[PDB]
Subunit: 106 residues, 4 copies
């Protein structure tokens, strides 16, 4: 998937985690988000199209995906332990990550 | 790229880091490992091909890549602070994560 | 030190980081927050004093400090690389973790 | 507890996690290790007794406790999900952390 496709996947599944009425729905959405974040690792965003992939600026870009991927990891452990309220509380943590990368690079 | 190709990138760069003398050599190798681990995320390995995509086995397979990505994240911070020997030692911690996933799924 | 004293150190240093101009101010504040979070680890908060020490509530109380310590770890790496604005933004992510634990246990 | 007391606690509970015949024994030992690691945060080791607590060398010392505390966090999520074999596999990850700090600072 390109960056825009992975972003729609993150957006749809974040909404699911906000509306989830059960653990299985949250677990399924977090697994799709993990796959979209991992796949977005390789992308060059438009604002950085004229920087080499080995540049410090691209390092600072990708750093936000480490944070998101880390937060999804924890949210899935919380969802697996039956903590349905907590797992959703993930949504507040993920949103801050979404916003920081968008503010710097979108 | 395919799972065996990402494993060759992980193996080759782990050896670059062992034999490295400076932070720029360690940084470049870890950047390539981060990209290979991220790219291997959605791979299905041969020994799990007849399992459900949401089998506990496929969950546990992907959990290994969360561990590896987390460790590469920390090693690149140490390399970025010019801590060459610490970054090299951190890359040595990766081997436990290599071995745990191989023991179960290779 | 006691839990309220560590909370005053976290609150005061979070504000130092917001108003900071340079990396040394951000580094010193985050070092104090790391020590306060670590010291608060084994505290029992007033609203959980009649629960088992291994109640899910006390497990969930300590999980919050794991999240906070992880975030302070990453913020100090960014401050150590001289990324003043990123470190300050990272300190802003702490507020979600502040709020989640307060919502349940303060 | 002083550093030596927290270290005996880490050592006794690591052995428990190596010998555990059930999840509850592993969970109890990981909780004691988390408390000992958090409490060891504030300590100055003998080899660094003549460095100020705000020094870079003490920062590099404490960094090893972030790694250990992070690894215990994950081991407890794995133990909680009923993964008794995996949870123990933690013991291999923790040992590497033990050894790195000891090699540099003991
Ligand atoms: C960087 C590390 C990012 C993180 C983390 C997240 N997003 Fe993102 N997103 C990013 C970029 C560079 C772009 C622009 C891509 C382009 O080619 O233009 C986006 C775009 C979106 C969009 C599209 C809407 C738009 O206004 O362009 C959406 C809906 C979106 N991103 C959602 C999203 C969510 C929900 C995230 C976290 C859960 C998230 N993104 C993280 C860069 C980054
Ligand atoms: C799972 C989560 C894994 C982690 C972490 C690592 N590896 Fe791996 N590796 C894994 C599998 C399932 C396989 C078999 C792939 C197949 O289709 O047969 C491998 C294989 C390798 C190989 C052999 C490659 C080949 O023959 O073409 C190597 C050299 C290898 N892995 C190295 C490696 C290193 C160095 C790792 C950590 C740094 C590592 N792997 C992690 C699964 C997983
Ligand atoms: C639980 C895991 C917590 C996290 C993370 C944070 N705080 Fe906290 N805080 C917590 C409790 C249980 C309490 C009540 C303590 C009591 O005995 O009443 C508090 C209290 C505070 C306060 C009030 C202190 C006082 O009145 O003396 C402040 C100002 C405060 N907390 C700030 C704070 C900040 C800034 C945090 C993140 C950076 C934060 N807390 C995290 C539990 C937890
Ligand atoms: C630094 C970040 C450390 C980590 C992580 C761990 N240990 Fe440690 N340990 C450390 C120091 C500086 C010392 C010496 C303290 C002193 O005053 O002399 C120790 C000591 C021990 C000992 C005592 C035996 C000895 O040879 O001195 C033991 C048994 C021990 N440590 C065990 C231990 C284990 C099991 C750890 C991980 C699970 C571990 N330590 C981590 C510094 C650090
Ligand atoms: Cl972020
Ligand atoms: Cl592993
Ligand atoms: Cl939290
Ligand atoms: Cl370590
Ligand atoms: Zn793609
Ligand atoms: Zn959609
Ligand atoms: Zn957790
Ligand atoms: Zn680190
Ligand atoms: Zn190490
Ligand atoms: Zn492992
Ligand atoms: Zn980081
Ligand atoms: Zn951020
Ligand atoms: Zn939270
Ligand atoms: Zn003590
Ligand atoms: Zn003993
Ligand atoms: Zn995990």
């Amino acid at each position: 998937a390109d960056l825009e496709d992975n972003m729609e996947t993150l957006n749809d599944n974040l909404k699911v985690i906000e509306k989830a009425d059960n653990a299985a729905q949250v677990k399924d959405a977090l697994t799709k988000m993990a796959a979209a974040a991992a796949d977005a690792w390789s992308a060059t965003p438009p604002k950085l199209e004229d920087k080499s992939p080995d540049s410090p600026e691209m390092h600072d870009f990708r750093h936000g995906f480490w944070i998101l991927i880390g937060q999804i990891h924890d949210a899935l452990h919380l969802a697996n332990e039956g903590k349905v309220k907590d797992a959703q509380e993930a949504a507040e943590h993920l949103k801050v990550t979404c916003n920081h990368c968008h503010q710097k690079y979108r």
